[PDB]
Ligand binder design. Structure first.
Ligand SMILES: [Cl-]
Ligand SMILES: [Cl-]
Length: 162
């Protein structure tokens, strides 16, 4: 299992514009297009992202290409963030995939806001960090995905995904 396969299980793949769990326009593998309510603003962002007139539909290839960039961006965002980088550096390979996953879903800003859990992860206090992460809108809004990410952090194994 690896980050790509992990995120592919969490986000799924849709080749036509769709609405995410929060109601925002998305396409592909969890690629957010816009938080605006307009399907047209959504189609525009899609064409700009792909480089062609898409009419809100893309191909598998196009989807994976966006996915590749977005994982790359997630990692570089972590490495560039003063709050995130130390945490990341401190973690083993599996748990790093868990933090990338959170960043991909909620952005660098959001994750960075998990001050206490981050501190507990740095300290390697798995069980306590897992309890802290669960007290969040995140866990309440997408509980199954959250449990999977959280177990990854608690265990350092891919069990939740197997
Ligand atoms: Cl883009
Ligand atoms: Cl969920």
């Amino acid at each position: 299992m690896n980050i790509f396969e992990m995120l592919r299980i969490d986000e799924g793949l849709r080749l036509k514009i769709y609405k995410d769990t929060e109601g925002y326009y998305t396409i592909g593998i969890g690629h957010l297009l816009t938080k605006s309510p307009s399907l047209n603003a959504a189609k525009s962002e899609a064409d700009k992202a792909i480089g062609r007139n898409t009419n809100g539909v893309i191909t598998k290839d196009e989807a994976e290409k966006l996915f590749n960039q977005d994982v790359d961006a997630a990692v570089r965002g972590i490495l560039r963030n003063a709050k995130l980088k130390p945490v990341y550096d401190s973690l083993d390979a599996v748990r790093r995939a868990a933090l990338i996953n959170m960043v991909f879903q909620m952005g660098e800003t959001g994750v960075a806001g998990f001050t206490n859990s981050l501190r507990m992860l740095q300290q390697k206090r798995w069980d306590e960090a897992a309890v802290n992460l669960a007290k969040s809108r995140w866990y309440n809004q997408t509980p199954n995905r959250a449990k999977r990410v959280i177990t990854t952090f608690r265990t350092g194994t891919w069990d939740a995904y197997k």
